Design a protein around this ligand. Structure first.
Ligand code: GNP
Ligand code: MG
Lengths: 994, 17, 123, 205
């Protein structure tokens, strides 16, 4: 029954509308839900705007009037120019009159702010259409009318604020370059009278609401107005004194002064420098006397969260960091400004103690700026010695686990601070360590934080000073661990001990007996059942190895053999209690060390010995499972095989090219294993259906295949002997994977096959032209059919497919020249299919392939294939690119859409296409490609955007073709087009902007 | 002795009781 | 929490699923600690599972001796069983539940704890 | 004690997925765009009693915007969502914020960067600063991995109740209760359930 308002044959029941509206805002359940769909359809009715004036006049529901203004807004925004002229002046007079009526009635001006703000915004949308060319007295009459009442003067500040935002802050995408410039120039011409009205209100009081609304509009002006209005008036004195005292105006005034700390000023004038000093001095004075003194505990204040204290402290941090990052040099030389400089930094110190992640990052960014300058700029660090001493403690106590980005910022600041005063940093850290020992500050979180801070300054002290520091730290940490009771406490401290020693490789490298003791200790921890310890021991082991590998490969003094031989020898007992992932990390670490041995025979011997246990287990299964293939369904057998291949992956990851001897030991049997597993998966799908691909048994089998491919990928991506890859590796690999991929049902095809082929083509693609052809033959058409029905199925295959086509188009373009014409047509379809994806991985690759394909065709010259390519697919690529550019569903690819389009258009206007792009009956003979290109595009846009005039399409195409060598201007013309198609009656002269 | 005692003290690092 | 008069026999990390029959689809219901709560006055065992962080209840039903744990075709670390009265979101409703664990060992250990509770609930 | 929460952001940023995860605990893998708005009651249990959010999950796509800023009237708090794998969704954050605060001039707002579970992150943490001058709370969240998924509501609850020490507490767990005419019915539903594989079998849980 509520669907009574959607019938516009009758007259609108205003009382019924007010009930439907309140049912949607105050109701619930199904009543609210279908009242929602009714209000949407009422609003989306193209004629509803005609019924907006009786709603705004007769309705008793402010929400109904809000919705009526929304319907008006859509009309003013999209169809204003299509209206008869008398309607435009009627709407304009109606809105002006209603706003005046709402400001006179004090109970509606006070209790209906949403409606007035929405009305002010609707008025601003009209000014964007009519002002100033058909409304040149708006600003003089706004100022005159402001002197009448206080409610109008305050409301005029709201209109001006919203006007400033629409013209300067949000115009860049919402309107054309020409229309934006027109509006900016109009406000700029008449701002002299706007600033006079604003300044008079701020100086004469007295209504707080009128003052705040005036300050809010001043905030917006500061984004663009010339500097003279700020420094050559008294307004800086008003902001930094009067308006800082009252809490009603404090928040907005602080934001205005923050923007002032960013204005474009002359760095030559000595008074502008004095005025920049003066308002900062006044602001800090008002804060110390009216808000809180410099000794106040801002951390507690922020945590109590009274009133707007949190937002004020956030705005104070923004103000101080912004001003001091730009102007602190103004305060560093004059001795009378020293206390002002240090109190301000002391407020930041107090602000930096607040428990608020995002606020801390804001202050940390400033500290980084400061301590970097004190590190490089002469005669500066001595000013801030007490500030920097406090900062050291703040950062040490707030050290985070090594957010990724936040730790790097803290480390860099702390490292700068250590350079500035090593001695002060040492005593603070040892003091904090002493307070961990006596128990006054003992905590798992506190001991970990301190250890991270100690480990972060590695490499900033002299090696000799570092030596005594490390020894003192490790000794005190060992005493801490010795004194605590329980494995929980001892594991935390032992973990911190290993973290610290892991962070000081210069110390470990100079003391082999200590380094050996560390490693032997980590091997003991690899048998610890307590959670986390085994993971920590393994992570520390590979971390230390990465930095001290040379000391494991050589024979240390008074040692009988390089320690790497001692590690490999006991590898079974060392790793016996580790989980498989931890064993793989161990083997990877050993591989790092072996690669340091540059004697080939000695490196291959260490590789053979390291791989001995997995090679023995491999030879067992290869003999056992090949005779006969039933064990490959045994759970335990599949797990052993996968863990053997993963061990090879881990070692190949750290050894790269040096891994080739071990790969040759298993390569042929591994590929045979790949075939056998592939048979069993296909057999299991046949016997049980597609659901078999989800069973544990098959997923274990696919893991084997994936790990095999990952191992091959890992070596080939890092190989140095590319010849051996081509003659030994590539051919048996293609025979093993391509046909199995092609002849499997879609649900059984491993997308990792495509990724592996991408790696092969990446490194040796220029050497295997026939191999690249066989890769396309086996995967191209069958994969395309999996992914060309929708945008959702087979997401992995989708991404790998276009990565593979991308590298083939780059490294072996001749493979596409060998495709039959029907297959090459599917190639073009698949490229355009990638345009239409919202998936960024597919979309970006698809546009890059199109751009690279055009360049591949261009470099062929005037030959039958290039000529035919243009006659067949040039306009396809032009029209498909225009489609994704203008459909509003692929905005993330605008930049690469523009460049591709610019490349296509520039080809025609550079006469790089020999053949005529038309058939010689379409158009009279002798017609240039440029003339036909404009005629094709004009017809295409006329049918795709019928609401455009012919003059708009012509002006747009004229500008676009002329600008196909200037990407920045070209893109501005596309953005202008994207604005004009959202509306009716766009000015065709807008395309003459450049 | 200072770095020798450190090495011995770490050698005795044990997690149990 | 209304867990005062109960003792914890078993606790395990788990993810709880419910079957949407009208959609041919499994749907997650919660992730957190699944506990075997044994009342000390009525001598009955129940399932209590709360979501991490929000602590909201995603499973609340007695380990009936008639329920049977059955494996899922795609998992060796899960059990599927029907539940006729669960009050995690109000009054008792019927659900086909699946519960998955971190490893096959925990799933096996859960099974041997689930029927041990079934032995207790029939006495 | 009820509060209206408007949730705004570009289409596909995961607004609806985030709400459903809090409503039912499920993770909806499919993108079905919201048409206008969907209102859902959401209740949390705190040490200060239960708090109820009336969540207005608005639509992100322009073609489905509906009443647009009409949904924001009388909102008491809000969440602005973007996708850290899509730079355009963070570029549009100021547009959503402008439209929002023009209606609601003084409400607590959380800015949320969703889908941090995805490896190839495109909007880097160092680039997310818009919340600073606007006094918004920011959180990295993931509806998929549940990373920080409770933080936006906890922070809003603390601001709305005005207690910074408010916490989520466990619901009181009542005692659960205790025919062969439906035995063949549940057996049929269990047969199809065992033959439908559980999603995300490679996850940790
Ligand atoms: N990897 C990942 N995907 C997510 C996550 N959250 C949501 N998604 C996915 O993002 C897609 C969009 O889903 P949806 O929740 O409807 O986004 P929306 O913002 O509500 N769309 P609209 O604004 O148009 O109504 C879904 O496919 C969903 O699976 C996440 O945390 N991680
Ligand atoms: Mg949605």
């Amino acid at each position: 029954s509520m669907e009574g308002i959607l019938d516009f044959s009758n007259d609108l029941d205003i009382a019924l509308l007010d009930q439907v509206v309140s049912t949607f805002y105050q109701g619930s359940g199904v009543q609210q839900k279908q009242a929602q769909e009714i209000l949407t359809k009422f609003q989306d009715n193209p004629d509803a705007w005609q019924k907006a004036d009786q709603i705004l006049q007769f309705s008793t529901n402010p929400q109904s009037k809000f919705i009526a203004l929304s319907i008006l807004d859509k009309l003013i925004t999209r169809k204003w120019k299509l209206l008869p002229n008398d309607h435009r002046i009627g709407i304009r007079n109606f809105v002006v009159g209603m706003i005046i009526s709402m400001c006179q009635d004090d109970e509606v001006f006070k209790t209906q702010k949403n409606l007035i703000n929405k009305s002010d915004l609707t008025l601003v949308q009209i000014l964007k259409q009519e002002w100033p060319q058909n409304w040149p007295e708006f600003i003089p009459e706004l100022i005159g009318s402001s002197s009448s009442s206080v409610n109008v003067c305050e409301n005029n500040m709201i209109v001006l604020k919203l006007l400033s935002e629409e013209v300067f802050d949000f115009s860049a995408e919402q309107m054309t370059q020409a229309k934006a410039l027109h509006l900016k120039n109009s406000m700029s011409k008449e701002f002299e009278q706007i600033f006079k009205l604003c300044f008079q209100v701020l100086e004469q009081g007295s209504s707080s609401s009128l003052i705040v609304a005036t300050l809010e509009s001043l905030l917006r002006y500061l984004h663009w107005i010339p500097y003279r209005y700020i420094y050559e008036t008294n307004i800086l004195e008003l902001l930094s004194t009067k308006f800082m005292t009252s809490p009603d105006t404090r928040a907005i005034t602080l934001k205005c002064l923050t923007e002032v700390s960013n204005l474009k000023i002359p760095q030559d004038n000595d008074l502008i420098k004095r005025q920049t000093v003066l308002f900062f001095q006044n602001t800090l004075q008002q804060i110390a006397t009216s808000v809180m003194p410099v000794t106040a505990d801002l951390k507690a204040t922020y945590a109590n969260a009274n009133g707007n204290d949190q937002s004020f402290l956030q705005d104070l941090a923004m103000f101080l960091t912004t001003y001091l990052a730009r102007n602190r040099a103004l305060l560093e030389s004059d001795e009378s400004l020293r206390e002002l400089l240090l109190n301000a930094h002391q407020y930041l110190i107090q602000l930096s103690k607040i428990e608020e992640r995002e606020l801390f990052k804001t202050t940390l960014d400033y500290w980084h700026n400061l301590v970097a300058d004190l590190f490089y700029e002469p005669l500066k660090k001595h000013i801030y010695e007490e500030i920097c001493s406090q900062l050291r403690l703040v950062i040490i106590e707030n050290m985070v686990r090594p957010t990724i980005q936040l730790y790097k910022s803290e480390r860099e600041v702390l490292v700068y601070l250590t350079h500035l005063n090593v001695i002060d940093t040492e005593e603070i850290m040892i003091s904090k360590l002493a307070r961990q020992i006596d128990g006054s500050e003992w905590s798992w979180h506190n001991i970990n934080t301190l250890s991270w801070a100690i480990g972060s300054i590695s490499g900033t002290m002299s090696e000799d000073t570092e030596k005594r520091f490390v020894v003192t730290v490790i000794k005190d940490l060992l005493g801490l661990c010795e004194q605590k009771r329980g494995k929980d406490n001892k594991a935390v401290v032992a973990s911190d001990i290993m973290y610290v020693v892991g962070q000081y490789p210069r110390f470990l490298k100079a003391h082999w007996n200590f380094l050996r003791t560390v490693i032997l200790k980590l091997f003991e921890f690899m048998h610890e059942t307590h959670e986390g310890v085994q993971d920590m021991a393994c992570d520390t082991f590979i971390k230390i190895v990465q930095k001290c590998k040379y000391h494991f490969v050589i024979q240390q003094p008074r040692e009988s053999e390089p320690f790497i031989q001692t590690i490999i020898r006991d590898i079974q007992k060392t790793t016996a209690d580790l989980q498989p992932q931890q064993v793989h990390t161990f083997y990877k670490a050993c591989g790092i060390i072996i690669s340091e041995e540059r004697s080939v025979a000695e490196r291959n011997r260490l590789l053979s010995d390291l791989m001995q246990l997995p090679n023995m287990a491999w030879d067992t299964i290869v003999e056992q499972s090949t005779a006969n293939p039933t064990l490959l369904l045994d759970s335990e057998t599949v797990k052993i095989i996968a863990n053997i291949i993963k061990t090879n992956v881990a070692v190949c990851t750290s050894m790269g090219a040096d891994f080739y001897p071990q790969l040759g030991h298993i390569y042929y049997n591994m590929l045979q294993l790949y075939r056998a597993v592939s048979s069993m998966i296909s057999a299991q799908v046949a016997a049980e259906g597609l659901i078999a691909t989800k069973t544990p048994k098959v997923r274990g089998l696919r893991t084997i295949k994936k790990e095999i491919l990952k191992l091959v990928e890992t070596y080939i991506s890092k190989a140095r002997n590319l010849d051996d890859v081509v003659k030994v590796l590539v051919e048996p690999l293609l025979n093993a994977v391509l046909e199995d991929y092609m002849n499997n049902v879609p649900d059984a095809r491993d997308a990792e096959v495509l990724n592996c082929m991408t790696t092969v083509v990446e490194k040796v693609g220029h050497m295997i032209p026939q191999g690249v052809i066989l890769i396309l033959q086996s995967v191209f058409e069958c994969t395309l059919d999996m992914i060309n029905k929708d945008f959702t199925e087979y997401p992995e295959h989708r991404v790998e497919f276009y990565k593979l086509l991308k590298v083939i188009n780059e490294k072996s373009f001749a493979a596409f020249l060998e495709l039959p014409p029907a297959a090459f047509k599917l190639f073009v379809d698949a490229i355009c299919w990638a345009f239409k994806h919202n998936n960024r991985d597919v979309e970006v690759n698809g546009l890059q392939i199109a751009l690279d394909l055009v360049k591949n065709i261009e470099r062929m010259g005037n030959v039958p294939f290039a000529n035919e390519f243009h006659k067949n697919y040039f306009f396809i690529f032009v029209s498909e690119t225009f489609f994704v550019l203008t459909d509003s569903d692929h905005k993330s690819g605008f930049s690469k859409q523009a460049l591709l389009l610019m490349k296509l258009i520039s080809l025609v206007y550079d006469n790089k296409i020999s053949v005529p792009l038309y058939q010689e009956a379409e158009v009279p003979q002798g017609t240039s490609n440029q003339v036909y290109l404009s005629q094709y595009l004009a017809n295409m846009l006329s049918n795709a955007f019928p609401h455009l005039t012919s003059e708009q399409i012509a002006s747009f195409l004229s500008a676009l073709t002329k600008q196909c060598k200037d990407l920045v201007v070209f893109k501005g013309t596309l953005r202008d087009f994207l604005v004009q198609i959202k509306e009716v009656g766009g000015d065709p002269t807008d395309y003459l902007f450049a | 002795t200072n770095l020798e005692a450190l090495q011995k003290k770490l050698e005795e690092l044990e997690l149990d009781e | 929490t209304m867990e005062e008069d109960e003792e914890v026999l078993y606790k395990v990390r788990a993810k709880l699923f419910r079957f949407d029959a009208d959609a041919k689809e499994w749907k997650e219901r919660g992730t957190g600690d699944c506990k075997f709560l044994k009342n000390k006055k009525t001598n009955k065992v129940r399932i209590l599972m709360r979501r991490d962080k929000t602590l909201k209840i995603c499973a609340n039903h007695i380990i009936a001796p008639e329920y049977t744990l059955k494996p899922n075709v795609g998992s060796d670390r899960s059990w599927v069983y029907a539940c006729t009265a669960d009050i995690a979101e109000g009054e008792a409703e019927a659900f086909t539940f699946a519960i998955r664990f971190g490893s096959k060992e925990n799933a096996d250990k859960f099974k041997e704890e689930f029927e041990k509770a079934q032995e207790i609930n029939k006495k | 004690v009820q509060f209206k929460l408007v949730l705004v952001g570009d289409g596909g940023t995961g607004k609806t997925t985030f709400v459903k995860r809090h409503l039912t605990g499920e993770f909806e893998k499919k993108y079905v765009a919201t048409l206008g708005v969907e209102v859902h009651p959401l209740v949390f249990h705190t040490n200060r009693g239960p708090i109820k959010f009336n969540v207005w999950d608005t639509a992100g796509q322009e073609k489905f915007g509906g009443l647009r800023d009409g949904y924001y009237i009388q909102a008491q708090c809000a969440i602005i969502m973007f996708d850290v794998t899509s730079r355009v969704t963070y570029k549009n954050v100021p547009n959503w914020h402008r439209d929002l605060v023009r209606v609601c001039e003084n409400i607590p707002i959380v800015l949320c960067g969703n889908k941090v579970d995805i490896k190839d992150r495109k909007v880097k943490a160092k680039s997310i600063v818009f919340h600073r001058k606007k006094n918004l709370q920011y959180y990295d969240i993931s509806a998929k991995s549940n990373y920080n998924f409770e933080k936006p509501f906890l922070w809003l609850a603390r601001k709305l109740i005005g207690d910074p020490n408010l916490e989520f507490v466990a619901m009181p767990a009542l005692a659960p209760p205790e025919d062969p005419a439906l035995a063949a019915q549940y057996e049929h539903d269990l047969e199809v359930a065992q033959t439908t594989a559980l999603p995300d079998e490679d996850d940790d849980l």
